[PDB]
Amino acid sequence: KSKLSGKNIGIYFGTFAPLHTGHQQQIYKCASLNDGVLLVVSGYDNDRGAQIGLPLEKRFRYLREAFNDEENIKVSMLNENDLPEMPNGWDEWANRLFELIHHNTLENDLSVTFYVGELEYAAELKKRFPADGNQYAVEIADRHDISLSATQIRENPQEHWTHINRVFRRHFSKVVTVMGSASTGKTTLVRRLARSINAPFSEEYAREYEEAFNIDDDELKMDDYARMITGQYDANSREVNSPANQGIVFLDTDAIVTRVYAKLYLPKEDFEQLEPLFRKTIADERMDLILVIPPIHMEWEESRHEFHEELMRQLAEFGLLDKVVILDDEGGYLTRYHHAIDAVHEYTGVKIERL
Ligand SMILES: NC(=O)c1ccc[n+]([C@@H]2O[C@H](COP(=O)([O-])OP(=O)(O)OC[C@H]3O[C@@H](n4cnc5c(N)ncnc54)[C@H](O)[C@@H]3O)[C@@H](O)[C@H]2O)c1
């Protein structure tokens, strides 16, 4: 189930940062021509992919998941940490690659077809066929378009979203988070933003937690704030990874806004016990634009300026200030929606109509 079955198989290379429609189209054509296909993800320790947060391992794992139900397609990893352009290193890169073939196949006396898209690779590869019983052959592939699409996807992700393979999409998603008091225009604001650009959105986990377990704000305890941290995060993850994500998604609240309600309203010894779960979660969050509703749930209502001042205190603590936009109105914009909807334009780049 984990080594390639057939007798003649073909080989397809790539950095795969990210994998996209182009690749897949070339791969299924490649699969229908052989009995099996060996994908080879190539990477080195600070390559184009790694620089944007998709290191060789991250790419490999995502690729394994992407082909997780294709029996006759195996994903391999060719790690490149050796000599540059004037090497005997082609000698070595070769048998690194031929190691991948021997390990991920049964059935000696194979018939291998390399599908290479760079001419120097085919020239240096043909010099280094090993003396097993396999008789390798090289064919040329048009990667002019495929490498060029990957270039554009990395540059403008939300412009080529539908061609990014779904496993890689969670990494390119823009994320807008709204934070604020029980001045919960935020929930209506979050919907109105997302539904105006057909985006998905999360809901305040605290509201759902309190209703399901049936407790008011004053009755929340340390054990409950921890359940709300992971609750809200999972809700937000669920949307970022949602199949209905079109490139940006909106989060109703954060671990920070639940940590503000937790430094307030919670004994200093108790709060200090949660700080590790708080770091772990806030570190696992990635936000692009943070919208804050200024002072305009029963216990969380009354302390608006208390919460709002502490919220900025914490937001500085985590260096998120330059992603923060405050939806004020007086003394610029007509409605806080107007201010907010235009903020999304500046921070994600989607087109919006005028009245
Ligand atoms: N059938 C199934 O597949 C199935 C069924 C039940 C459970 N599960 C489990 O559920 C999981 C599904 O995915 P997951 O929840 O583990 O994903 P995950 O927790 O691995 O994803 C977290 C990543 O997404 C980003 N992220 C998440 N929330 C964010 C936010 N609010 N803002 C910015 N960035 C954010 C982070 O950068 C982080 O690296 C699987 O790991 C699986 O084990 C799967």
Between CA 83 and CA 306 the distance in angstroms is 60
Between CA 175 and CA 347 the distance in angstroms is 10
Q: Which residues pair with 23 in a beta bridge?
A: none
Specify the residue with its C-alpha closest to ligand 1, atom 27.
Answer: 237
Ligand 1 proximity of 68 Cβ (cutoff 6 Å): no
Q: How far is CA 288 from CA 285, 324, 345, in A?
A: 10, 9, 12
Q: What are phi and psi of 281, to 5 degrees?
A: -75, -50
- Strand order through the sheet with 137-140: 73-79, 36-43, 8-14, 111-116, 137-140
Structure tokens at 123: 């020239």
Which residues are within 8 A (CB) of 126 and not within 5 positions of it... i.e. 6 or more apart? Answer: 138
Q: What are phi and psi of 44, to 5 degrees?
A: -135, 170
Ligand 1 proximity of 171 Cβ (cutoff 6 Å): no
Judging by beta carbons within 10 Å of its beta carbon (0-12, 13-18, 19+), is residue 56 exposed, middle or buried?
A: buried
Specify the residue with its C-alpha closest to ligand 1, atom 31.
Answer: 236
Q: Which residues pair with 248 in a beta bridge?
A: 174
Q: How far is CA 170 from CA 52, 53, 157, in A?
A: 13, 12, 11
> Which residue is associated with the tokens 């109703």?
252
Between CA 168 and CA 170 the distance in angstroms is 6
Between CA 133 and CA 38 the distance in angstroms is 18
Q: Which residues pair with 116 in a beta bridge?
A: 140
Beta-strand relationship, 73-79 and 111-116: unpaired
Which residues are within 8 A (CB) of 301 and not within 5 positions of it... i.e. 6 or more apart? Answer: 181, 182
Judge whether 299 and 265 are in contact, CB under 8 Å: yes
Nearest Cα to 20, choosing from 205, 182, 148? 148
Which residues are within 8 A (CB) of 161 and not within 5 positions of it... i.e. 6 or more apart? Answer: 169, 172, 246, 247
Ligand 1 proximity of 237 Cβ (cutoff 6 Å): yes
Distance, CA 237 to ligand 1 centroid (Å)?
5
- Strand order through the sheet with 324-326: 248-251, 174-180, 289-293, 324-326
Nearest Cα to 182, choosing from 314, 295, 341? 295
Q: How was this structure determined?
A: X-ray
Between CA 165 and CA 20 the distance in angstroms is 5
Judge whether 112 and 8 are in contact, CB under 8 Å: yes
Ligand 1 proximity of 73 Cβ (cutoff 6 Å): no
Judge whether 300 and 217 are in contact, CB under 8 Å: yes
End-to-end CA distance of the chain: 59
Between CA 342 and CA 311 the distance in angstroms is 23
Stated resolution in angstroms: 3.0
Which residues are within 8 A (CB) of 221 and not within 5 positions of it... i.e. 6 or more apart? Answer: 270
Please state, as a whole number, how many other Cβ atoms lie within 10 Å of the Cβ of residue 8.
17
Nearest Cα to 248, choosing from 354, 352, 149, 345? 345
Distance, CA 175 to ligand 1 centroid (Å)?
15
Structure tokens at 335: 């409605």
Beta-strand relationship, 137-140 and 111-116: parallel
Which residues are within 8 A (CB) of 253 and not within 5 positions of it... i.e. 6 or more apart? Answer: 177, 178, 179, 186, 202, 204, 205, 206, 232
Looking only at Cα atoms, what is the longest distance across the chain? 81
Which residues are within 8 A (CB) of 136 and not within 5 positions of it... i.e. 6 or more apart? Answer: 112, 113, 114, 129
3-state helix/strand/coil string of the chain: CCCECCCEEEEEEECCCCCEHHHHHHHHHHHHHCCEEEEEEEECCCCHHHHCCCCHHHHHHHHHHHCCCCCCEEEEEEECCCCCCCCCHHHHHHHHHHHHHHHCECCCCCEEEEEECCHHHHHHHHHCCCCCCCCCEEEECCCHHHHHHHHHHHHCHHHCHHHECHHHHHHHCEEEEEEECCCCHHHHHHHHHHHHCCCCECCCHHHHHHHHHCCCHHHCCHHHHHHHHHHHHHHHHHHHCCCCCCCEEEECCCHHHHHHHHHCCCCHHHHHHHHHHHHHHHHCCCCCEEEEECCCCCHHHHCHHHHHHHHHHHHHHCCCHHHEEECCCCCCCCCHHHHHHHHHHHHHCCCCCCC
Between CA 161 and CA 121 the distance in angstroms is 31
Query: Dihedral through CA 275, CA 279, CA 280, CA 284, nearest 10?
Result: 150
Ligand 1 proximity of 240 Cβ (cutoff 6 Å): yes
Q: How far is CA 157 from CA 58, 78, 286, 342, in A?
A: 18, 26, 16, 20
Closest ligand 1 atom to Cα of 286:
33
Closest ligand 1 atom to Cα of 236:
31
Distance, CA 231 to ligand 1 centroid (Å)?
12
Ligand 1 proximity of 285 Cβ (cutoff 6 Å): yes
Closest ligand 1 atom to Cα of 254:
31
Instruction: Count Cβ neighbours within 10 Å for each residue of 17-51 and write b for 16 or more, e otherwise.
Output: bbbbebbeebbeebbeebbbbbbbbbbbeebebbe
Please state, as a whole number, how many other Cβ atoms lie within 10 Å of the Cβ of residue 84.
6
Distance, CA 209 to ligand 1 centroid (Å)?
20
Between CA 190 and CA 164 the distance in angstroms is 26
Q: How far is CA 32 from CA 9, 141, 142, 295, in A?
A: 10, 15, 17, 62
Closest ligand 1 atom to Cα of 238:
15
Tell me how far the alpha carbon of residue 348 is from its chain's centroid.
Answer: 16
Give the orientation angle of helix 21-33 with respect to helix 144-155, to 10 degrees: 150
> Which residue is associated with the tokens 């940590």?
259
